[PDB]
Every structure is written in C-alpha cells, then in structure tokens.
C-alpha cells in the first residue's frame, strides 16, 4: 500500500530527526489537509500526484487526531530504535478513517474470506456484532459459491447466528454469496432464506450469459495448465457463475495441501488471461490460502447492491477485510484485530 | 538471513531474465565454488567479503542438488509471475545443510521455546520421529525458561514426548542419549528408565562452562531490572517484573504486549549492558508476549555438549525457529550446523528428510 | 532508464555470484530473445510486463554481441569489485543498436542542444561527420528559434561548415530549427538558405495558429511565475512559434547565470500546466543548461518530417542526443562520446 | 557524503508532505541540537549511531541558519517538483560551518590537484581572493604531486598566484604566512619576498610526521607496482608505470583510461597494502586520467602545519573537492574543519562568504 508508506517514511524522518516525540502537529496538519484536498479533488489533487494508486476518499480524514489518539494509548514516539512500522500505521488509518465517520453509519459489512475465523467463531466477536445490528446494517460477504444452497452456507459460519437467536429478537443482517451474485436474510428462528431476485435483480450490473460462461472456460483453462504444469493433486469444480480449485482428499478425514505459492500463481494466471480477451465485465479470483475460486463478480458490485437495496450513502458504509472506491475500507489480518476495531467503532 | 537474501537476490536476476527455469547450473556452481572457498578459509573468503555476517560453513554445501532436487519437487521455477521467494531459498539451504551430513549426524538440538509446540507439547506425530533419530544419536532440548534445577517444572511442558520414550524408546537403552538445557546454557538435565527427567548438579560439567562472577551475574540481572521497570513506566504497560536466580524477565498479568515494544526493550537492554563492557555470556529473549534475560547464550549451552559429549563441530546439527538477527539463534550459527524453521510442521519435514541415512 | 537498469541488476547479480567473467552467454541469450519478442510483439511482449515503458524496438537488438563487443576491448568483467555500471551498460546497448544496423542507415541525426557543444567545435567530428554525408543523409536539430532568420542558425554552428566547403563537392545535409518548425539545407558556397514550404509543409502535423499562440501564452505565464517567485534576473522572448527564458546580462561581455535546478522546475511546470488546458498537439520544454526554450513542436514530429520528405524507412534513421519511439536512438552526454559512436558507425 | 544524505532524506520526507516551504524549524532545530549533542560527545553521540561514519564536529553548527539564510538566497522550498538536492545540502552545510567560524580561523588548506584550476593556475579572480585572506591568516596549498623536494617542479602549476603575490602581497610582509605540502605529507615549502617557492628540510620538521621505515616505504612502493602492472595485463592498458622515493603512479603515454579501471585498483592497492597489516601512513589518490600512491596522508600533512603553526584545530579549515568516501579528502575530516566544493566558482564562492569577519 502506497499511501501507508508515504506515511511511515515521513515518521521514519522526523523520528530519525529526533523531533517525533516533540511537536509533529506542524507536519501532520499539513498532511491531514493534503488528504482533505483529496477528498474534494480527488483527480487532480497534489496527493494524487504523490500517491498515484492513492484511491478516492468518501471523508476527511482526521490523521492528524488518529496520530494523537493511537500515540497516547501505545506510546510509540517514546522509542529510541525502532520507528513506527508499517502495521502500526495501518491501524492509524483505520482509526482516522473510523473517527471519520462522525455522521455515523448505517452499513457495515465483513469480509469473511480468512479475517473472520480458519474454519467454521468469536464470542466476543458475536457479542460485538449484535451491538452493531441494533445500530445499524450489517453484512458478511463470501467468496465460497454453493449457488442458492443456504444450507452450506450456514454450515460455515453458524455459530454466530447462534448468538443472533438469543439477545435479539432484527431484519437488518445480510448474507452475500458467490462474492455479488447471492443475497440472503434472517428471520426469526435460527435462519437462512434467500431474497427473491426482484429486490436486488435490477441492481446487478447487466453481464450476458455466454459472458459468464467465457470467463469460467478461460479459468477452467489455467487451472487446468496450473494442474498440470505444478502437478499438483487437486479437483476443478465449475458452478453456475464460478469455477474453484480445490485439493483432493487423502484416502481413508483431511485432505491435501496446495503450496500458497503455487496458488497465488494462479490467481495472476487466470487475471492476465481474462484481460487477455478483453473482457470488461466484473469478476474476481481471491485465495483463500488454502482454495482458489473465481467468481463472476466482485466486492465492489455487491458493496454498490446493498447500498442500493438498502439506500444508504457511500459516507455510511464501512468494510473490513484482509484485502475499493465505493465503501471505507479497514485494513486487518486476524480475528482479534476485527473485534479491536469493533470495540472502537461501539462509540 | 543475509545469505538467504544473497540467494534471493540473484534467482530474481535469474526469473527477470526469463532463464530461471532453463539451466542456470553455471549460475549455481559458481556459488557453490565460492561456499566451498568458505568452507576453507572462513577467514578472508571472498564470500565474507560479499557477506561480512555469514557465519562458518563446518561442511561443503550441495546448494546446486539442493535447488535441483528442491524444484523437482515444487517446481518453483515454472512460475511466471513470482520468483524464488525468501522462505524457498530457505528451504533449499535447509536442505542443502541436510545433504552435507553424509559424514554423520552425532548430536541434533531443538529449540524447546517454539519449534516442538506452539505451550504444551502434543504433537504425537514429531515425538514419533524423534524416538527413530534418538536411537542413533544424542539429541537434546534447549530452552529459554529458567528454573532453578527445578526438573519437576522443566518436564511439564515435555511429558508427552517424554512419557512416549517409555513406551518405545526405554528397552533400547537409547534413554541415556537424551538432554535438556534449561537457562539458555545453565542447568543440564537427563532421562531414566521411567521416564523422568532428573538433574545433573552444575558442578559436575561447569568445566565445559565458562565461569562468571555472582557479582557479575547480579549486574546484569539489575541492569535489565531498570530497564524493563523504565520501559513499563515510559509505554504505560500492565505487566511486571519477574526475577530469578541468573535470570529476570517481564511478564504480564495476561494482558497481551506488543511486539515492537518487546523488541526495543532488548536493544536498550543489549545496548546498556554493551555501556558497561560486560564480556559474560548472556541473552535477551523475546517471548510471544514476554521478554526474558538470561546469563548465559545459546552459543554457550550447544559448546558444553560438544565438549562434554566429546562430538565433533561438524557432526552437531541445531534447529531453531527465529534465526533472525535480534533472535538467540543467531550466534548458534558459529558452532554448529543449523536449519532455520518455522513450526512443527516444517520441522517434522526437516526431520523426514533427516530419515535418509545410507 | 529503466531499461538500462533492467541490465544492470542482472549484471550486478551475475558479478555477485562470481561468474561474470565465465560464460554468462546462456543469460545473454535468454534476455536476446526477449528483445527480438518485443520487436515483434511491442505491445504484449513478456518484456513488457518487466519494463512498462520499454519502447519500441525497430531493430533485432544483437546484446550478446554487443556485450562481448564490449568486454574485449575494455574487459570489465575482470573487475574484482564495481559490476558493470549504469555508463558502461548505457554504452553496450549504443552499440547493440548501432551493431543492429546490418542493412545500413540512410538517415543520421543529432541532437545539438548540447551534447555538440558548450558555445558556437571538433574538426575530428567534422571529419567524421563529413564521411558519413557521402554515406547517407544527415541532419542537425536545435531547439533555439530565430524564426527564418537563416544567419542565426548559422553563427551557432558555423565552424563545421567551415570543413564541409573543403573536401566535399552534397546536398544530402539538413538543418531544422525551431525542433520541427524550419528546415534549412546548403548550396554550395559556405551556405544557409531555406527549403520553400511547400517542400514540407503537408508532413507537418497539422495545428491551429490560436492553439499555437494558446500554448506560449500558457509558457508566458508560468515563466512570469518562476521569474518572480525565484527571484530572477531575467528577460522573457516571445516568438511565431516558440517562447524563451534568457537571464540578464550584466551591464558594462557575459550575461548573468539562473541556477540549474530552477530551469528543470519550471520545466515540470510549464509541462504540467500545458496538461492542464488538455492540449493535444505536440510540443517540447527543453533546459539547456543557461537557457530555457519551448516550442510547439519535438524531436519526433521533426523526425517524422525528415523520413518523409527524403523517404527513408525508420528502420534506417539514427538519432545521438543528451535526452523516441520513431527512430533509434543512442545515449551520450560529451563531444567525445559522440565522435566515438560516430567511429564505431563507420563500418 | 552520509551526513548529506542524512539531510537530504530529511528534507525529501518534509517537501513530499507539504509543508516544507512552512515552518520546518522544530525539526530543525531537532537537527541542530543533535550536531551539539556530537559536538560535545563525539564517541557514544545520538546522531554516531544513526550516522557511524560522521566525523568530527569541531565547531557548533548553525544548521538552522544555514538553510534559513541559503533559503531566503535562491528560495529552494518555493520549488514544488523538486525536493532539496544533494549538492543543496551540501551548500547548506558549507555555510553552516562557515558560520562555525566565529572564534577565528588562522589556517586555510586547499587542495592544489583540483580546487584551484582544472593543469595550470588561470585565475585572477581566485588569486585576488587569497591575497586579502593571506594578510589576516595563513593558507597552505597541499598536493599529492610528488617531486623529490624540487621547489622548481611545484612552482610551474602555481607561478600566476604566487607572482600575483609579488604585487600586492610582499610589502606587508604576509609572504611568510604561505605554506606548500608536496606528496600529501612528505614535502613542505615556503615563500620568500622574491615571489619564489623555496624549500625546508624535511628534517626540520619531521618531529611532527610520524616516522616510516625506508623498507617500508619502499614495500608500499613494491605492492602497488605488483597491482599496477597486473591492473595494465588484465585491462589491456597502454600506460606506464612511474616510480620515484615515496611515491609510485600510473601514468598513460596521452591515451585517457576508463574512470572503473583506475578506481578498481584503487581498491585493489588499497586491500594489498592491507592484506600486510600495514599501518604507515598512504592514500591512493585517484586522478583524472592517473593514478597515484603516495606514503602519506593529507590528514597527517594537515596535522604537521597545527604542530608546526601551533594553531588550534577548530581554528584550521580545509577546502577539497574529492570528498567522497575513496577519496582522499574523506579522512581529514577527523583533524580540521572541511568545505565540500567542486570547482574554482564554487571555491571562489566559498572563499567570498568567508571574508565576513566582524
């Protein structure tokens, strides 16, 4: 990420000058405001000819109370070898970008691709997210496709909507499948229902059938190649609107590893090919470290349906994943860090 | 960690100019020359030169059968978009260093803190592994935590692996081949017949080790103890300060720390203790969630076993985990063979392929 | 360059693993191969996907060659301790591209803003230059304008013409002032008369007289900018097709000296702002040292001017400057260097 | 070279975040309070463990006038796509430690090989410089040009500025006041009213050079005559070698040789004479197109004048163009004040700040 480097070699100045400890406000304010210009020109701003992938920003980012807040819990200008790292940083952004949000917000939605758990969860985490319900919209978007069979995707995360049945009562929790391509409710006890199509087939982006199927071919084709070439044990499963790799099992249970690699090959494999025959449709092909799955969509599209569906402005909507220009994006890689910024955002 | 990114560095060179996956053995037997010219004259190799850290090679490394055999298996090399990474060429010096004990493996040391379990050991499928090596050749555990000689303490975190000996490793006599170090390189203990770890008294091996003064020892103990009830004081932490006999640590009460503040409290302790010119052996370990000083390094404890079991320098093979520059490994690469690791999992394969005797 | 850098990473990579000086031929020909596939795959060539702004090749570049070429004569590789430098592979990949010229250049063209010469020169590179006439067709570009006033173009570089009356006779010499806005050519006399427009007047890329006149207005002001922010003592010139900072002369002789870095940034925002108004048509800022100069025209559409008017395939154009993708281009920086190619060109 | 940089990255980080035409004094300052934390502490200093090869401060550094007054003369924060250069950061401290100069400075060293003309002394403007600054302190001119103390040979480079002493400098008797070093510290020389280089006898002050046995001296010689003549075999060289009593160089016939194949055996010379444990005192000065190896240093020739002249070092200031860390003007950093320059205009430049007394 270039915008968090800009910063940490800005901070790996001034505490190689001696003077982070000291009054940096004269710096940051001067940051904070190159960030504000950005968030009215975002096209032509001086940010965007520092920081070219910077990325448009939906709020005023207040950095400058992020870098105060953050420095008087942890302290780190009191070190006197180590200046603030990259990851300390990223957790500054996602404060200032958090403390931005003073009109509040109405949607928040989870990246359940690794940050949530490895496996089928957190009761603190649970705890915190019914918090949030009652406030406002949530969801939970998954890049895993069982097409409209809600039976497996409950099966994945159905310790949560454990809580959800006790300590609630509402209607305001989502379920996103096949990445854009699969929206599900709640009702009342212990559910999992799917939406009929005409509240959300309207604000799908138009994508011909032969089109969805290309992509599929052309990512059945590289797996395939993949398989091949890496020698890898694993099967290809195609869907209606995505196609996955993933391990054979070990015969008896377990089932086998893939090198995360070789899977990260793929993924660049299969995104060179696709723009190889020009397709402009929206797709997406994630690894989940130890799967590969392509989907005919991505999270922008189904970050833009339910801020659609459920009206609310792009100001209000907040993401929180491990990985765009249509919801504000809280960085994180486990858990623990999705409960932490969880736990600021209750004021 | 350097030679690693000297690796790293030149198949990136390679991958670039799109000649990575044809043959680049002459690539590769240049460096292989130039490892065996270490190996001879560690002194003022050319490789020292390129790589002043580098450390001592005891034995001529196969880097080219390394690479070779190591793409064979992964097939690194037909990627298009990612080159070599850092933790495949560690992988390949790993077993590179593995395929230089043709000439035998005598003593094999684990560090006990993070290689074996993640804690309490449970893993049945490594003790199994250690059972088969144990039988040719000595092996022996060397950990941070510091009781003093306190065995009944040293085994809780080793019963498994330990009661496992009795069940198929107690009949063999391979038992009395079996040590741990507790204290870095202070207290030695061994096995009997009921699977039991019982002490040795440091007086009867203290010979191996070099003595240092209860004066000296106290020294650095309260040097450290100012600095961690400094850093506590300066960062607002909630943990507090823990102190034993030859060793003082920070632990909290448990409230997680973080790691970058761990990490710079053993540059002040390592940069004060430097202030006052103490020669002694000595550490500081930086734990998960705590920080450890011990007297005593681990450069220490593995020369003991060589002296008191008689091993050869070339015959002794350590695994440790964290063989970066601030970890307690690093000096180890000065007296024995080594081989980075990660976690059990890497190490039961180092371990595997440590199963090809001949 | 990135492009030279490219090389010289891999050099420095080979010199670090001890085998530079043995046969490095097998890498040699591997990078070969992926020069001649973007010779004919410019536009998707894996080449491409390392260097983003590689170029066009109109040549099959021979670098093995070159680099052999180069090691036998200066043998670098012997060096125990400085790979191959940033210069030395600059130099090789001049003389893979002049080696590439297997069937003859009819086309030579310099730069002669100052790689030539400092002030108004070398009569080893009359000499040289003199040969090569006879050869095929040469040319000399100036950013300078005097409009049409052919004596001008003449007093800043009359000395070589000097040695082209003697030993000559023809008329396959070419001067083109205002970058690509006046082309000159000589009788027989010690001469500077210029070609009538008709000559040359539909290659020019056609451009409005108010676009022309709107981009020195832009220049105008920005130098009225740069003069009063950095305080200069200096006078702007206004001409048909060009606009020009010249500093003061002292009163009394030699004129007084702006500092380097103060042209190179006014450059960047003469250029940034020339962006700005979205303006189309081509044109060029170039820093000489002492002088800045923008005229609405460059190298490449003066370039394209002399393959058209005399015929000649790009393939056999050949250009020598300080500082594109219409004809091959060597790098230097002295006098000397570019007698020393023009050396090597002589077979 | 690194102290640049130091700032240089400093200035870069305040210019891309904007605010670096406003008010940077806290840095500054920041900056500033650390060159007096060197200045007092030059051992164990804050700024030595971020900088290890810094050098000396002899004198308290202005920094922050410096870039205040540079500044405020050719506005270089007013620029918005270029932060501040090398050679601006160079400037800055230029000035700075001429405004370190308030206490005095009563002796000025240049560098003769490439200070003071491009070669042949041409200059009257330079000249006209040095005459007034004569008349208040003594100036010394060092050269690593080596002729066997022959007051002839060193005069031919330096007849324009010392006959302009003749004219407006012998009356006043400041004549005396003007020193020659040949050989970097082998030859002193002084003036006479008759505007001629005449010579002392390295006897008479060789109480303040470090003695070097003539074996030594000559095994010097004979190393760099082995790399020299292997250097022109391996390159394919046209030159020559040239020996004379402590000083051997590398002279062409005059085909110019390439910039790497002179710096290269630099190197080469230098790691040799190391290779032996040697711990006279040389320098490999590298010319323009020769190279040279001289037995001497110009930091011990700039000691012998403080001995001799009984100045103090903070009053003792150096001009040299070759500041680089292969140069040879990168040790004197540790035994008088510097002055990075690079040519006449800019020396004349320096020369002209520095006649500000008050």
């Not at 949530?138 to 994945?156: C, F, G, H, L, W």
Request: aromatic share 12%; glycine share 4%.
């Amino acid at each position: 990420d270039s915008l968090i480097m800009f910063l940490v070699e800005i901070f790996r100045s001034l505490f190689v000058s001696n003077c982070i400890d000291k009054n940096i406000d004269n710096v940051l304010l001067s940051i904070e405001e190159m960030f504000i210009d950005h968030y009215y020109n975002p096209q032509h701003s001086r940010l965007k000819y520092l920081i070219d992938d910077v990325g448009i920003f939906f709020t005023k980012l207040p950095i400058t109370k992020a870098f105060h807040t953050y420095n008087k819990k942890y302290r780190i200008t009191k070190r006197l070898y180590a200046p603030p790292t990259f990851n300390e940083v990223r957790h500054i952004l996602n404060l200032a970008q958090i403390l931005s949000l003073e009109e509040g917000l109405d949607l928040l939605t989870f990246d359940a691709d690794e940050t949530l758990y490895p496996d089928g969860n957190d009761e603190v985490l649970a705890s915190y997210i019914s918090c949030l319900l009652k406030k406002m919209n949530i969801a939970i978007v998954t890049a895993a496709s069982y097409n409209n069979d809600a039976e497996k995707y409950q099966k994945r995360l159905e310790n949560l909507l454990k809580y959800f049945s006790k300590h609630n009562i509402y209607k305001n929790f989502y379920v996103m499948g096949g990445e854009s391509n699969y929206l599900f409710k709640c009702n009342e006890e212990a559910t999992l229902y799917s939406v009929p199509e005409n509240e959300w087939r309207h604000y799908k982006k138009f994508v011909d059938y032969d089109t969805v199927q290309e992509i599929l071919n052309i990512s059945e084709k590289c797996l395939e190649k993949v398989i091949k070439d890496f020698g890898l044990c694993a099967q290809i499963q195609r869907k209606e609107k995505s196609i996955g790799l993933v391990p054979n099992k070990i015969p008896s249970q377990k089932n086998y590893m893939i090198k995360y690699e070789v899977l990260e090959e793929a993924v660049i494999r299969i995104k060179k090919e696709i723009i190889k025959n020009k397709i402009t449709a929206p797709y997406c092909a994630f690894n989940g470290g130890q799967d590969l799955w392509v989907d005919v969509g991505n999270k922008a599209e189904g970050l833009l349906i339910l801020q659609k569906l459920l009206k609310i402005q792009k100001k209000k909507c907040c993401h929180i994943g491990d990985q765009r220009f249509c919801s504000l994006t809280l960085w994180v890689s486990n858990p623990q860090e999705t409960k932490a910024c969880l736990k600021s955002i209750m004021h």
